[PDB]
JSON list of C-alpha atoms in Angstrom, two decimals:
[
{"chain": "A", "resi": 1, "resn": "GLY", "atom": "CA", "xyz": [-3.47, -4.39, 12.26]},
{"chain": "A", "resi": 2, "resn": "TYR", "atom": "CA", "xyz": [-3.52, -3.09, 8.78]},
{"chain": "A", "resi": 3, "resn": "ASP", "atom": "CA", "xyz": [-4.84, 0.59, 7.74]},
{"chain": "A", "resi": 4, "resn": "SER", "atom": "CA", "xyz": [-8.42, 0.66, 6.79]},
{"chain": "A", "resi": 5, "resn": "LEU", "atom": "CA", "xyz": [-8.03, 0.15, 3.14]},
{"chain": "A", "resi": 6, "resn": "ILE", "atom": "CA", "xyz": [-5.81, -2.96, 3.03]},
{"chain": "A", "resi": 7, "resn": "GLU", "atom": "CA", "xyz": [-8.07, -4.01, 5.93]},
{"chain": "A", "resi": 8, "resn": "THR", "atom": "CA", "xyz": [-10.68, -3.97, 3.42]},
{"chain": "A", "resi": 9, "resn": "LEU", "atom": "CA", "xyz": [-9.01, -5.31, 0.10]},
{"chain": "A", "resi": 10, "resn": "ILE", "atom": "CA", "xyz": [-8.12, -8.33, 2.52]},
{"chain": "A", "resi": 11, "resn": "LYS", "atom": "CA", "xyz": [-11.51, -8.78, 3.66]},
{"chain": "A", "resi": 12, "resn": "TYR", "atom": "CA", "xyz": [-12.75, -8.95, 0.26]},
{"chain": "A", "resi": 13, "resn": "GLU", "atom": "CA", "xyz": [-9.76, -10.26, -1.00]},
{"chain": "A", "resi": 14, "resn": "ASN", "atom": "CA", "xyz": [-12.51, -13.24, -2.99]},
{"chain": "A", "resi": 15, "resn": "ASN", "atom": "CA", "xyz": [-14.74, -10.08, -4.65]},
{"chain": "A", "resi": 16, "resn": "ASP", "atom": "CA", "xyz": [-14.34, -8.07, -7.39]},
{"chain": "A", "resi": 17, "resn": "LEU", "atom": "CA", "xyz": [-13.36, -4.68, -6.11]},
{"chain": "A", "resi": 18, "resn": "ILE", "atom": "CA", "xyz": [-14.79, -1.06, -7.83]},
{"chain": "A", "resi": 19, "resn": "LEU", "atom": "CA", "xyz": [-11.63, 1.25, -6.61]},
{"chain": "A", "resi": 20, "resn": "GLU", "atom": "CA", "xyz": [-13.08, 5.42, -7.37]},
{"chain": "A", "resi": 21, "resn": "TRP", "atom": "CA", "xyz": [-10.81, 8.05, -7.23]},
{"chain": "A", "resi": 22, "resn": "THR", "atom": "CA", "xyz": [-12.11, 11.86, -6.47]},
{"chain": "A", "resi": 23, "resn": "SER", "atom": "CA", "xyz": [-10.04, 12.37, -9.84]},
{"chain": "A", "resi": 24, "resn": "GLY", "atom": "CA", "xyz": [-12.83, 10.63, -11.44]},
{"chain": "A", "resi": 25, "resn": "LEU", "atom": "CA", "xyz": [-10.59, 7.51, -11.71]},
{"chain": "A", "resi": 26, "resn": "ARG", "atom": "CA", "xyz": [-12.64, 4.15, -11.63]},
{"chain": "A", "resi": 27, "resn": "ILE", "atom": "CA", "xyz": [-11.23, 0.80, -11.98]},
{"chain": "A", "resi": 28, "resn": "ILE", "atom": "CA", "xyz": [-12.34, -2.52, -11.44]},
{"chain": "A", "resi": 29, "resn": "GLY", "atom": "CA", "xyz": [-9.96, -5.95, -10.44]},
{"chain": "A", "resi": 30, "resn": "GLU", "atom": "CA", "xyz": [-9.01, -8.34, -7.70]},
{"chain": "A", "resi": 31, "resn": "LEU", "atom": "CA", "xyz": [-6.50, -8.17, -5.05]},
{"chain": "A", "resi": 32, "resn": "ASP", "atom": "CA", "xyz": [-3.31, -9.93, -6.08]},
{"chain": "A", "resi": 33, "resn": "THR", "atom": "CA", "xyz": [-1.03, -9.95, -2.94]},
{"chain": "A", "resi": 34, "resn": "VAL", "atom": "CA", "xyz": [-0.28, -7.36, 0.25]},
{"chain": "A", "resi": 35, "resn": "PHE", "atom": "CA", "xyz": [3.42, -6.59, 1.14]},
{"chain": "A", "resi": 36, "resn": "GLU", "atom": "CA", "xyz": [5.28, -4.44, 3.58]},
{"chain": "A", "resi": 37, "resn": "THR", "atom": "CA", "xyz": [6.98, -1.60, 1.60]},
{"chain": "A", "resi": 38, "resn": "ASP", "atom": "CA", "xyz": [8.32, 1.81, 2.42]},
{"chain": "A", "resi": 39, "resn": "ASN", "atom": "CA", "xyz": [9.10, 4.88, 0.23]},
{"chain": "A", "resi": 40, "resn": "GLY", "atom": "CA", "xyz": [12.60, 4.50, -1.12]},
{"chain": "A", "resi": 41, "resn": "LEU", "atom": "CA", "xyz": [13.87, 7.52, 1.06]},
{"chain": "A", "resi": 42, "resn": "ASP", "atom": "CA", "xyz": [16.81, 6.95, 3.57]},
{"chain": "A", "resi": 43, "resn": "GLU", "atom": "CA", "xyz": [15.84, 5.97, 6.91]},
{"chain": "A", "resi": 44, "resn": "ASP", "atom": "CA", "xyz": [18.04, 9.03, 8.17]},
{"chain": "A", "resi": 45, "resn": "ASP", "atom": "CA", "xyz": [15.10, 11.23, 6.01]},
{"chain": "A", "resi": 46, "resn": "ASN", "atom": "CA", "xyz": [12.69, 12.78, 7.89]},
{"chain": "A", "resi": 47, "resn": "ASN", "atom": "CA", "xyz": [10.02, 11.94, 5.40]},
{"chain": "A", "resi": 48, "resn": "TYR", "atom": "CA", "xyz": [11.16, 8.44, 5.28]},
{"chain": "A", "resi": 49, "resn": "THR", "atom": "CA", "xyz": [7.59, 6.21, 5.78]},
{"chain": "A", "resi": 50, "resn": "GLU", "atom": "CA", "xyz": [7.21, 2.68, 5.97]},
{"chain": "A", "resi": 51, "resn": "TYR", "atom": "CA", "xyz": [3.34, 1.48, 5.13]},
{"chain": "A", "resi": 52, "resn": "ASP", "atom": "CA", "xyz": [1.76, -1.64, 3.31]},
{"chain": "A", "resi": 53, "resn": "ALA", "atom": "CA", "xyz": [0.69, -1.88, -0.29]},
{"chain": "A", "resi": 54, "resn": "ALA", "atom": "CA", "xyz": [-1.60, -3.81, -2.44]},
{"chain": "A", "resi": 55, "resn": "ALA", "atom": "CA", "xyz": [-0.67, -5.20, -5.55]},
{"chain": "A", "resi": 56, "resn": "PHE", "atom": "CA", "xyz": [-3.90, -4.90, -7.34]},
{"chain": "A", "resi": 57, "resn": "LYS", "atom": "CA", "xyz": [-4.99, -6.68, -11.05]},
{"chain": "A", "resi": 58, "resn": "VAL", "atom": "CA", "xyz": [-6.94, -3.78, -12.98]},
{"chain": "A", "resi": 59, "resn": "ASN", "atom": "CA", "xyz": [-9.37, -5.84, -15.07]},
{"chain": "A", "resi": 60, "resn": "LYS", "atom": "CA", "xyz": [-11.31, -2.77, -16.90]},
{"chain": "A", "resi": 61, "resn": "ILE", "atom": "CA", "xyz": [-10.70, 0.60, -16.64]},
{"chain": "A", "resi": 62, "resn": "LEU", "atom": "CA", "xyz": [-14.36, 1.81, -15.99]},
{"chain": "A", "resi": 63, "resn": "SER", "atom": "CA", "xyz": [-13.97, 5.80, -16.23]},
{"chain": "A", "resi": 64, "resn": "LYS", "atom": "CA", "xyz": [-10.70, 8.05, -16.96]},
{"chain": "A", "resi": 65, "resn": "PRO", "atom": "CA", "xyz": [-9.88, 11.17, -15.15]},
{"chain": "A", "resi": 66, "resn": "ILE", "atom": "CA", "xyz": [-9.99, 14.22, -17.46]},
{"chain": "A", "resi": 67, "resn": "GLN", "atom": "CA", "xyz": [-6.39, 15.39, -15.96]},
{"chain": "A", "resi": 68, "resn": "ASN", "atom": "CA", "xyz": [-3.24, 13.10, -15.90]},
{"chain": "A", "resi": 69, "resn": "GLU", "atom": "CA", "xyz": [-2.11, 13.94, -12.35]},
{"chain": "A", "resi": 70, "resn": "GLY", "atom": "CA", "xyz": [-2.51, 10.77, -10.60]},
{"chain": "A", "resi": 71, "resn": "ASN", "atom": "CA", "xyz": [0.22, 8.10, -10.20]},
{"chain": "A", "resi": 72, "resn": "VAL", "atom": "CA", "xyz": [-2.14, 5.21, -10.42]},
{"chain": "A", "resi": 73, "resn": "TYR", "atom": "CA", "xyz": [-3.23, 5.72, -13.63]},
{"chain": "A", "resi": 74, "resn": "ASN", "atom": "CA", "xyz": [-0.07, 6.90, -14.68]},
{"chain": "A", "resi": 75, "resn": "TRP", "atom": "CA", "xyz": [1.36, 3.60, -14.56]},
{"chain": "A", "resi": 76, "resn": "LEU", "atom": "CA", "xyz": [-2.14, 1.98, -16.11]},
{"chain": "A", "resi": 77, "resn": "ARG", "atom": "CA", "xyz": [-2.28, 4.12, -18.98]},
{"chain": "A", "resi": 78, "resn": "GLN", "atom": "CA", "xyz": [1.42, 2.90, -20.15]},
{"chain": "A", "resi": 79, "resn": "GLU", "atom": "CA", "xyz": [-0.17, -0.90, -20.52]},
{"chain": "A", "resi": 80, "resn": "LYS", "atom": "CA", "xyz": [3.05, -2.23, -19.26]},
{"chain": "A", "resi": 81, "resn": "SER", "atom": "CA", "xyz": [1.31, -4.16, -16.84]},
{"chain": "A", "resi": 82, "resn": "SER", "atom": "CA", "xyz": [-2.03, -4.49, -15.28]},
{"chain": "A", "resi": 83, "resn": "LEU", "atom": "CA", "xyz": [-0.86, -4.78, -12.00]},
{"chain": "A", "resi": 84, "resn": "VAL", "atom": "CA", "xyz": [-0.54, -1.77, -9.63]},
{"chain": "A", "resi": 85, "resn": "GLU", "atom": "CA", "xyz": [0.17, -0.54, -6.54]},
{"chain": "A", "resi": 86, "resn": "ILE", "atom": "CA", "xyz": [-2.43, 0.51, -4.31]},
{"chain": "A", "resi": 87, "resn": "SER", "atom": "CA", "xyz": [-2.05, 2.55, -0.61]},
{"chain": "A", "resi": 88, "resn": "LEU", "atom": "CA", "xyz": [-3.06, 5.20, 1.63]},
{"chain": "A", "resi": 89, "resn": "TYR", "atom": "CA", "xyz": [0.44, 6.74, 1.16]},
{"chain": "A", "resi": 90, "resn": "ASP", "atom": "CA", "xyz": [0.95, 7.66, -2.50]},
{"chain": "A", "resi": 91, "resn": "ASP", "atom": "CA", "xyz": [-2.50, 8.64, -4.67]},
{"chain": "A", "resi": 92, "resn": "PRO", "atom": "CA", "xyz": [-4.84, 6.66, -2.74]},
{"chain": "A", "resi": 93, "resn": "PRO", "atom": "CA", "xyz": [-8.42, 5.78, -3.60]},
{"chain": "A", "resi": 94, "resn": "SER", "atom": "CA", "xyz": [-11.59, 7.82, -2.12]},
{"chain": "A", "resi": 95, "resn": "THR", "atom": "CA", "xyz": [-13.86, 5.02, -2.04]},
{"chain": "A", "resi": 96, "resn": "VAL", "atom": "CA", "xyz": [-13.91, 0.75, -2.40]},
{"chain": "A", "resi": 97, "resn": "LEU", "atom": "CA", "xyz": [-17.37, -0.56, -3.65]},
{"chain": "A", "resi": 98, "resn": "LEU", "atom": "CA", "xyz": [-18.52, -4.14, -3.94]},
{"chain": "A", "resi": 99, "resn": "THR", "atom": "CA", "xyz": [-20.14, -5.05, -7.61]},
{"chain": "A", "resi": 100, "resn": "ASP", "atom": "CA", "xyz": [-23.51, -4.50, -6.04]},
{"chain": "A", "resi": 101, "resn": "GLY", "atom": "CA", "xyz": [-22.71, -1.18, -5.26]},
{"chain": "A", "resi": 102, "resn": "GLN", "atom": "CA", "xyz": [-22.18, -1.18, -1.45]},
{"chain": "A", "resi": 103, "resn": "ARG", "atom": "CA", "xyz": [-19.52, 1.15, -0.14]},
{"chain": "A", "resi": 104, "resn": "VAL", "atom": "CA", "xyz": [-17.05, -0.66, 2.33]},
{"chain": "A", "resi": 105, "resn": "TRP", "atom": "CA", "xyz": [-14.31, 1.79, 2.11]},
{"chain": "A", "resi": 106, "resn": "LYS", "atom": "CA", "xyz": [-14.42, 5.57, 2.46]},
{"chain": "A", "resi": 107, "resn": "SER", "atom": "CA", "xyz": [-11.69, 7.81, 2.93]},
{"chain": "A", "resi": 108, "resn": "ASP", "atom": "CA", "xyz": [-11.40, 9.79, 5.64]},
{"chain": "B", "resi": 1, "resn": "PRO", "atom": "CA", "xyz": [28.22, -11.03, -14.39]},
{"chain": "B", "resi": 2, "resn": "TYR", "atom": "CA", "xyz": [25.37, -9.14, -13.26]},
{"chain": "B", "resi": 3, "resn": "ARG", "atom": "CA", "xyz": [21.80, -8.34, -15.59]},
{"chain": "B", "resi": 4, "resn": "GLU", "atom": "CA", "xyz": [19.74, -5.63, -15.69]},
{"chain": "B", "resi": 5, "resn": "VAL", "atom": "CA", "xyz": [15.99, -5.46, -15.21]},
{"chain": "B", "resi": 6, "resn": "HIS", "atom": "CA", "xyz": [15.08, -2.01, -16.26]},
{"chain": "B", "resi": 7, "resn": "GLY", "atom": "CA", "xyz": [18.30, -0.33, -15.63]},
{"chain": "B", "resi": 8, "resn": "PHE", "atom": "CA", "xyz": [18.40, -1.91, -12.20]},
{"chain": "B", "resi": 9, "resn": "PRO", "atom": "CA", "xyz": [21.38, -4.60, -11.27]},
{"chain": "B", "resi": 10, "resn": "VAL", "atom": "CA", "xyz": [19.70, -8.25, -10.71]},
{"chain": "B", "resi": 11, "resn": "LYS", "atom": "CA", "xyz": [22.01, -8.23, -7.39]},
{"chain": "B", "resi": 12, "resn": "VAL", "atom": "CA", "xyz": [21.05, -9.04, -3.87]},
{"chain": "B", "resi": 13, "resn": "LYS", "atom": "CA", "xyz": [21.31, -5.47, -1.55]},
{"chain": "B", "resi": 14, "resn": "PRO", "atom": "CA", "xyz": [22.36, -7.48, 1.16]},
{"chain": "B", "resi": 15, "resn": "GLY", "atom": "CA", "xyz": [21.87, -5.42, 4.13]},
{"chain": "B", "resi": 16, "resn": "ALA", "atom": "CA", "xyz": [17.85, -5.12, 2.50]},
{"chain": "B", "resi": 17, "resn": "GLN", "atom": "CA", "xyz": [17.46, -8.67, 2.32]},
{"chain": "B", "resi": 18, "resn": "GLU", "atom": "CA", "xyz": [18.90, -9.49, 5.58]},
{"chain": "B", "resi": 19, "resn": "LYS", "atom": "CA", "xyz": [15.98, -7.43, 7.28]},
{"chain": "B", "resi": 20, "resn": "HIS", "atom": "CA", "xyz": [13.54, -10.55, 6.29]},
{"chain": "B", "resi": 21, "resn": "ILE", "atom": "CA", "xyz": [16.41, -13.28, 7.35]},
{"chain": "B", "resi": 22, "resn": "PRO", "atom": "CA", "xyz": [16.45, -14.65, 10.75]},
{"chain": "B", "resi": 23, "resn": "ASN", "atom": "CA", "xyz": [19.28, -14.60, 13.08]},
{"chain": "B", "resi": 24, "resn": "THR", "atom": "CA", "xyz": [21.04, -11.70, 11.07]},
{"chain": "B", "resi": 25, "resn": "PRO", "atom": "CA", "xyz": [22.00, -8.26, 12.49]},
{"chain": "B", "resi": 26, "resn": "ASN", "atom": "CA", "xyz": [19.58, -6.46, 10.57]},
{"chain": "B", "resi": 27, "resn": "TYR", "atom": "CA", "xyz": [16.72, -8.97, 11.14]},
{"chain": "B", "resi": 28, "resn": "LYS", "atom": "CA", "xyz": [17.44, -8.62, 14.95]},
{"chain": "B", "resi": 29, "resn": "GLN", "atom": "CA", "xyz": [17.20, -4.74, 14.98]},
{"chain": "B", "resi": 30, "resn": "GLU", "atom": "CA", "xyz": [13.66, -4.72, 13.14]},
{"chain": "B", "resi": 31, "resn": "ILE", "atom": "CA", "xyz": [12.30, -7.08, 15.82]},
{"chain": "B", "resi": 32, "resn": "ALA", "atom": "CA", "xyz": [14.30, -4.90, 18.33]},
{"chain": "B", "resi": 33, "resn": "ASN", "atom": "CA", "xyz": [12.38, -1.72, 17.21]},
{"chain": "B", "resi": 34, "resn": "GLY", "atom": "CA", "xyz": [9.19, -3.28, 17.42]},
{"chain": "B", "resi": 35, "resn": "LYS", "atom": "CA", "xyz": [8.87, -4.83, 13.76]},
{"chain": "B", "resi": 36, "resn": "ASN", "atom": "CA", "xyz": [7.71, -7.89, 12.46]},
{"chain": "B", "resi": 37, "resn": "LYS", "atom": "CA", "xyz": [9.03, -8.17, 9.27]},
{"chain": "B", "resi": 38, "resn": "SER", "atom": "CA", "xyz": [7.96, -11.21, 6.79]},
{"chain": "B", "resi": 39, "resn": "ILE", "atom": "CA", "xyz": [10.48, -14.44, 6.88]},
{"chain": "B", "resi": 40, "resn": "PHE", "atom": "CA", "xyz": [12.81, -14.86, 3.87]},
{"chain": "B", "resi": 41, "resn": "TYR", "atom": "CA", "xyz": [13.92, -18.80, 3.60]},
{"chain": "B", "resi": 42, "resn": "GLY", "atom": "CA", "xyz": [17.43, -19.25, 3.46]},
{"chain": "B", "resi": 43, "resn": "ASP", "atom": "CA", "xyz": [20.17, -16.86, 2.93]},
{"chain": "B", "resi": 44, "resn": "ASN", "atom": "CA", "xyz": [21.32, -14.22, 0.08]},
{"chain": "B", "resi": 45, "resn": "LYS", "atom": "CA", "xyz": [22.72, -17.18, -1.61]},
{"chain": "B", "resi": 46, "resn": "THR", "atom": "CA", "xyz": [19.02, -18.38, -1.66]},
{"chain": "B", "resi": 47, "resn": "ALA", "atom": "CA", "xyz": [17.95, -14.71, -2.96]},
{"chain": "B", "resi": 48, "resn": "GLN", "atom": "CA", "xyz": [20.80, -14.10, -5.66]},
{"chain": "B", "resi": 49, "resn": "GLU", "atom": "CA", "xyz": [19.93, -17.70, -7.02]},
{"chain": "B", "resi": 50, "resn": "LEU", "atom": "CA", "xyz": [15.90, -16.61, -7.04]},
{"chain": "B", "resi": 51, "resn": "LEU", "atom": "CA", "xyz": [16.73, -12.85, -8.58]},
{"chain": "B", "resi": 52, "resn": "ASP", "atom": "CA", "xyz": [18.71, -14.67, -11.19]},
{"chain": "B", "resi": 53, "resn": "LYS", "atom": "CA", "xyz": [15.64, -17.26, -12.26]},
{"chain": "B", "resi": 54, "resn": "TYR", "atom": "CA", "xyz": [12.91, -14.76, -11.39]},
{"chain": "B", "resi": 55, "resn": "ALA", "atom": "CA", "xyz": [13.59, -10.62, -11.78]},
{"chain": "B", "resi": 56, "resn": "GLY", "atom": "CA", "xyz": [11.97, -9.74, -14.50]},
{"chain": "B", "resi": 57, "resn": "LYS", "atom": "CA", "xyz": [9.63, -12.45, -15.28]},
{"chain": "B", "resi": 58, "resn": "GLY", "atom": "CA", "xyz": [6.79, -11.62, -12.90]},
{"chain": "B", "resi": 59, "resn": "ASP", "atom": "CA", "xyz": [4.66, -8.27, -13.00]},
{"chain": "B", "resi": 60, "resn": "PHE", "atom": "CA", "xyz": [5.73, -4.89, -12.11]},
{"chain": "B", "resi": 61, "resn": "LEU", "atom": "CA", "xyz": [3.29, -2.83, -10.18]},
{"chain": "B", "resi": 62, "resn": "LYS", "atom": "CA", "xyz": [5.61, 0.27, -10.19]},
{"chain": "B", "resi": 63, "resn": "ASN", "atom": "CA", "xyz": [8.69, 1.11, -11.61]},
{"chain": "B", "resi": 64, "resn": "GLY", "atom": "CA", "xyz": [10.99, -0.65, -9.17]},
{"chain": "B", "resi": 65, "resn": "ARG", "atom": "CA", "xyz": [8.51, -3.35, -7.91]},
{"chain": "B", "resi": 66, "resn": "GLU", "atom": "CA", "xyz": [7.62, -6.39, -9.35]},
{"chain": "B", "resi": 67, "resn": "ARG", "atom": "CA", "xyz": [5.69, -9.29, -7.77]},
{"chain": "B", "resi": 68, "resn": "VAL", "atom": "CA", "xyz": [6.77, -12.76, -8.82]},
{"chain": "B", "resi": 69, "resn": "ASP", "atom": "CA", "xyz": [4.79, -16.05, -7.79]},
{"chain": "B", "resi": 70, "resn": "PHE", "atom": "CA", "xyz": [7.67, -18.10, -7.53]},
{"chain": "B", "resi": 71, "resn": "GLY", "atom": "CA", "xyz": [5.61, -21.50, -7.70]},
{"chain": "B", "resi": 72, "resn": "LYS", "atom": "CA", "xyz": [6.94, -22.62, -4.12]},
{"chain": "B", "resi": 73, "resn": "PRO", "atom": "CA", "xyz": [7.81, -21.69, -0.74]},
{"chain": "B", "resi": 74, "resn": "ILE", "atom": "CA", "xyz": [9.94, -18.85, -0.26]},
{"chain": "B", "resi": 75, "resn": "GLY", "atom": "CA", "xyz": [9.24, -17.87, 2.91]},
{"chain": "B", "resi": 76, "resn": "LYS", "atom": "CA", "xyz": [6.24, -17.09, 5.31]},
{"chain": "B", "resi": 77, "resn": "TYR", "atom": "CA", "xyz": [4.07, -13.35, 5.50]},
{"chain": "B", "resi": 78, "resn": "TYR", "atom": "CA", "xyz": [3.33, -12.35, 8.51]},
{"chain": "B", "resi": 79, "resn": "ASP", "atom": "CA", "xyz": [-0.38, -11.61, 8.80]},
{"chain": "B", "resi": 80, "resn": "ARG", "atom": "CA", "xyz": [-0.91, -8.44, 10.59]},
{"chain": "B", "resi": 81, "resn": "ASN", "atom": "CA", "xyz": [-4.68, -9.70, 11.82]},
{"chain": "B", "resi": 82, "resn": "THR", "atom": "CA", "xyz": [-3.23, -12.89, 13.44]},
{"chain": "B", "resi": 83, "resn": "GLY", "atom": "CA", "xyz": [-0.01, -12.10, 14.46]},
{"chain": "B", "resi": 84, "resn": "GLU", "atom": "CA", "xyz": [1.26, -15.52, 13.10]},
{"chain": "B", "resi": 85, "resn": "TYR", "atom": "CA", "xyz": [3.00, -16.43, 9.86]},
{"chain": "B", "resi": 86, "resn": "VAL", "atom": "CA", "xyz": [1.60, -18.18, 6.47]},
{"chain": "B", "resi": 87, "resn": "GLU", "atom": "CA", "xyz": [3.86, -19.78, 4.29]},
{"chain": "B", "resi": 88, "resn": "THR", "atom": "CA", "xyz": [3.95, -18.21, 0.65]},
{"chain": "B", "resi": 89, "resn": "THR", "atom": "CA", "xyz": [5.06, -18.68, -2.73]},
{"chain": "B", "resi": 90, "resn": "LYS", "atom": "CA", "xyz": [4.89, -14.78, -3.86]},
{"chain": "B", "resi": 91, "resn": "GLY", "atom": "CA", "xyz": [7.28, -12.15, -3.39]},
{"chain": "B", "resi": 92, "resn": "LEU", "atom": "CA", "xyz": [7.68, -8.36, -4.17]},
{"chain": "B", "resi": 93, "resn": "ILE", "atom": "CA", "xyz": [11.32, -7.88, -5.68]},
{"chain": "B", "resi": 94, "resn": "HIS", "atom": "CA", "xyz": [12.15, -4.04, -4.45]},
{"chain": "B", "resi": 95, "resn": "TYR", "atom": "CA", "xyz": [14.74, -2.98, -6.80]},
{"chain": "B", "resi": 96, "resn": "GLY", "atom": "CA", "xyz": [17.44, -0.41, -6.50]},
{"chain": "B", "resi": 97, "resn": "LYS", "atom": "CA", "xyz": [20.63, 1.47, -7.63]},
{"chain": "B", "resi": 98, "resn": "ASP", "atom": "CA", "xyz": [22.74, -1.01, -4.67]},
{"chain": "B", "resi": 99, "resn": "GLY", "atom": "CA", "xyz": [20.77, -4.27, -5.62]},
{"chain": "B", "resi": 100, "resn": "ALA", "atom": "CA", "xyz": [17.41, -5.91, -4.98]},
{"chain": "B", "resi": 101, "resn": "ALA", "atom": "CA", "xyz": [15.40, -7.30, -2.20]},
{"chain": "B", "resi": 102, "resn": "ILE", "atom": "CA", "xyz": [12.86, -10.21, -2.10]},
{"chain": "B", "resi": 103, "resn": "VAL", "atom": "CA", "xyz": [10.30, -9.04, 0.33]},
{"chain": "B", "resi": 104, "resn": "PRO", "atom": "CA", "xyz": [7.62, -12.28, 1.03]},
{"chain": "B", "resi": 105, "resn": "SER", "atom": "CA", "xyz": [3.94, -11.38, 0.75]},
{"chain": "B", "resi": 106, "resn": "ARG", "atom": "CA", "xyz": [0.69, -12.32, 1.65]},
{"chain": "B", "resi": 107, "resn": "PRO", "atom": "CA", "xyz": [-0.54, -15.58, -0.33]}
]
């Protein structure tokens, strides 16, 4: 099956979702699609990694992190697109919440 | 003449695209390795025609990764929750220096 984060986003694909980061970034948005991908490295590279990722449509930034160290916020803050890649491989969130506040996924 | 989108050529990278095309060497090696790749309909010419029309016309989610709703079926997505395939109109174009590939994605 899917990893626990991708599984959660698919389970709640019909929900507005709040994603939080340890950095203090908080966004709200909706799942657009899910796709099989990798980290661009050669298949011979010992760091080559395949993973599933979500395309996530950000409808509002609810909290800006006080530092700019995360890849997700560094993409969003340019405003070239409100779609962003979400995965466990690269700059994972710490929590997924429903809009009633219920925590449906938390990082391990 | 190959156009460019954000510095990447709008040209199929054959080996990368073939990982999603049944009966190709690269597809058959993915399946032998225990993967179940989403299926892209047609061949590398189908992929080049879709790239010509849609590359740069979708929404980027990361440098070198663009989601496109193609408005018609382009393949079948492998649903890991069921182990079966679902027809899809959506794809993620993965760009590189040696060309791009269309990865069918979840509808």
